[PDB]
């Protein structure tokens, strides 16, 4: 059961640093090179370098020299990668991946990158943490078509991602469409969650969207009522 398990998502200001980790299990950590590969959003894989977990020796692609430091702790079979002085265009998912078998030996076999960690998102933004303003999207005659009514919640101007929305504490799940967030030019996000329900059921049933923004320690239950 060969696994690489990376540490959790990180959100940073330009100029800051971050240290991400990659815990290996199910094989002999010191017997394989560890690589790191990043992927900026919507873009291709970019190899960063490798570390030899047996010696600690490293090798960095050119554009990662001088601000990337790969280390390891063999005690706990863990590789680390420290990124120094982040720029906004370092925003990316950062992967560790196990590489060539038996470093510096007659049996050296690089057959690709056969096992990948799950990735660590690193978001670099000058925006500052901020909980959302949650507003009802009231069902009206204009939000109704053919006896079903659409109502929802606007989750406005928050940072960073993610936010989760449920409805009526998890009891209302059919008809729920939570849209992916827009990143506005202010650097803050907005998203909406909408639910289609029987227009005869408004008046008898209460609708509450439950918004959780864990990065700001904020939760909002917003009642959504007809006009």
């Amino acid at each position: 059961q060969v696994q690489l398990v990376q540490s959790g998502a990180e959100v940073k200001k330009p100029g800051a640093s971050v240290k991400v980790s990659c815990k290996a299990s199910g094989y002999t950590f010191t017997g394989y090179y560890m690589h790191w590969v990043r992927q900026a959003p919507g873009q291709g894989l970019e190899w960063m370098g490798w570390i030899n977990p047996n010696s600690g020796g490293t090798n960095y692609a050119q554009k990662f020299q001088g601000w990337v430091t790969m280390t390891r702790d063999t005690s706990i079979s863990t590789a680390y990668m420290e990124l120094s002085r982040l720029r906004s265009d370092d925003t990316a998912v950062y992967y560790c991946a196990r590489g060539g078998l038996e470093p510096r030996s007659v049996d050296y076999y690089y057959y690709g990158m056969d096992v990948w960690g799950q990735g660590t998102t690193v978001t670099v933004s000058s925006a500052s943490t901020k909980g959302p303003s949650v507003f009802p999207l009231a069902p009206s005659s204009k939000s109704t078509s053919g006896g079903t009514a659409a109502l929802g919640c606007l989750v406005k101007d928050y940072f960073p991602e993610p936010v989760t929305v449920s409805w009526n504490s998890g009891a209302l799940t059919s008809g729920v469409h939570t849209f992916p967030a827009v990143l506005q030019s202010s650097g803050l996000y907005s998203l909406s969650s909408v639910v289609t329900v029987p227009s005869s059921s408004l008046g008898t049933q209460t609708y509450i969207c439950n918004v959780n923004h864990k990065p700001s320690n904020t939760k909002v239950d917003k009642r959504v009522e007809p006009k």
């Binding site: 090798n59 057959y111 303003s133 849209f179 992916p180």
Partner: protein, 212 residues
């Protein structure tokens, strides 16, 4: 050094054979490995040493490597093969792994569909906080390309618009959304506002009005 050149997109009908090329100078002399990356996931090694498969990978995935072109070949293409495919070599001048730029495989034949559009006006709660946002939700369209334009009383509004890129829904159609920010005075001073969605040459337009 080894600069690996892949076509950005390849499309193929179900059951057919997809070929994704990876071009490089004397790539034939290096061992080429191929990773598959499905939306949302970490990459997966699908072919190594030009033609071998890791255990678990179906036999429909094969590759060749000769001269100046390596080729990932996917036989009997299923819709579950939609993914980004990357080739990879190891440069000998500097123990440096080089990736190709990636190839998007789109599997053809999914049914087209015009967008459904729902437009909400500013809530009274927001207006009472001295702000106003119009929300235009766009769903169930395919293919996943759309253009969004906003009007106040039929003249075009270009400031204050924020629109997502489309993204796949669980039913394999796409969704997007667009937001128009304005002041409560701007919202009340016009007779109507419109969100107008263009998809494959045809438009769906929804209107809201402050006094409604």
């Amino acid at each position: 050094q080894s600069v690996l050149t892949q076509p950005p997109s390849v499309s193929v009908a179900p059951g057919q054979t997809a070929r994704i090329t990876c071009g490089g100078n004397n790539i034939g002399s290096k061992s080429v490995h191929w990773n598959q990356q499905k939306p949302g996931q970490a990459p997966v090694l699908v072919v190594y040493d030009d033609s071998d498969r890791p255990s678990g990978i179906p036999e429909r995935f094969s590759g060749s490597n000769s001269g100046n072109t390596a080729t990932l070949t996917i036989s009997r293409v299923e819709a579950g093969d939609e993914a980004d495919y990357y080739c990879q070599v190891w440069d000998s001048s500097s123990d440096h792994v080089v990736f190709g730029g990636g190839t998007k495989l789109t599997v053809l034949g999914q049914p087209k569909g015009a967008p459904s559009v729902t437009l909400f006006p500013p809530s009274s709660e927001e207006l009472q906080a001295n702000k106003a946002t119009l929300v235009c939700l766009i769903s169930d369209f395919y293919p996943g390309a759309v253009t969004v334009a906003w009007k106040a009383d039929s003249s075009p509004v270009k400031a204050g618009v924020e629109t997502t890129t489309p993204s796949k829904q669980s039913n394999n159609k796409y969704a997007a959304s667009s937001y128009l920010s304005l002041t409560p005075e701007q919202w009340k001073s016009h007779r109507s506002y419109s969100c107008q969605v263009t998809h494959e040459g045809s438009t769906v337009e929804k209107t809201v009005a402050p006094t409604e």
